[PDB]
Design a protein around this nucleic acid. Sequence first.
DNA 1: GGGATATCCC
DNA 2: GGGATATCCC
Lengths: 240, 240
Amino acid sequence: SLRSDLINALYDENQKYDVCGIISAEGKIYPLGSDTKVLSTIFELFSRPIINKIAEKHGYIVEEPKQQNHYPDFTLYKPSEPNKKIAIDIKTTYTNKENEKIKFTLGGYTSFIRNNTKNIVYPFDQYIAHWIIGYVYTRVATRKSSLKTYNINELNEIPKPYKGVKVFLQDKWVIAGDLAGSGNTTNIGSIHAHYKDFVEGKGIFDSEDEFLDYWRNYERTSQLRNDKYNNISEYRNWIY
Amino acid sequence: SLRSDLINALYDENQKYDVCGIISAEGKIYPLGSDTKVLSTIFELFSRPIINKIAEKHGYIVEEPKQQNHYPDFTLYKPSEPNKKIAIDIKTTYTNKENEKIKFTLGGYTSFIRNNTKNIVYPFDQYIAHWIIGYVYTRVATRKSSLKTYNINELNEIPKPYKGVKVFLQDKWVIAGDLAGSGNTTNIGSIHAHYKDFVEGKGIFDSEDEFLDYWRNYERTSQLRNDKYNNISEYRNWIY
DNA sequence: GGGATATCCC
DNA sequence: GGGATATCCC
């Protein structure tokens, strides 16, 4: 199973998280910081070697998006059956101190979910599956960068911005919740839970329809969200 | 002074502003793509040692945010005059045909611009000058990242994400415009001209005052502002 | 012009 | 939760 195989190779098969810094054509190295906007990519870069791997020994093609504002990170599939498209999307998140509850943002709620074609490499329908690859790290901060330029020799010196990474795979609908992850950016939110709750997929929506419906009609303004619904209890009761 | 000194440094004191890729500690390199959220940060890393070296040589202390979502990136200050705080923010944009017109997005019009302390490192009132260090660049059209992992020796075979970089130092009110930069995120729009106009510091606003009142007044959307004001030439009369 | 990519702060 | 960094895409 693409999945089983996948999950398998994600948990240290020989993989080690060691990205120390950025490098300029001048040969001089600049360390990282807690910028999430860059860490994200670093997280995806760790996966890109392993997805493609499996994908290979399974006979599917992988297609990264050409444009900067389209979902999802990866698009696996076989030409023959070019309707059985799977979709993998990398999501990171940080912790401060050990064993805290986490949460991720699961993506747009007013895009291809409701539009089918808006911002997605392929029309929403060609996908049979949508997976999520979640990462958790202990951010090492109290930050203010590392005010210094390095060289190819001090690599070992270079401090990283993360510690004790944790990965897991799961279907999106399984770990989705009933609250926006981001406001203005209309994102969906994840379940507030213990990392392991994710592994196990101890969610809240009973199936993928329950997850689409809920999100399909999650009004955007609190004003309109009152006389309709704010959560699972609210929605469920809305079934009658 | 502090200002023109910075410029020299930032105007070919030798620097090239080129990046290669990401770099691990086992020494294995990974290339980059034109992704903005990344490039905007790398350009950042480049700027910090340049800034530090100048300030420090004029006896200024430097400040960086702890929160990743507060303004400004940099914060130079003289303790012998703590109320004389200056801001520096890196702003990037790209173009294909090495010449076409330009546009930047300089911050939110509904935060420190109207309440003194929302999402700002120190209070707005404690700042004398607000500077924009802008970078422009030609990006390899389309986008091809590839997944090869070079190394120090193959430092040359590695594809760069951009080429022909440009930089400018100028004041925030001189380069601002009368249209939004973005919408949902509520950002100020830089002027839509040509590199040079920027260097010229050939704007539209009359004063650092007009721009203030201006953006201080920007209604969040079409409905409201369409019957108030939608541009400076409109701002004007409205002022009566 | 409005909303889209990611995830975060108070 | 609402608004914030980064800027773009359509």
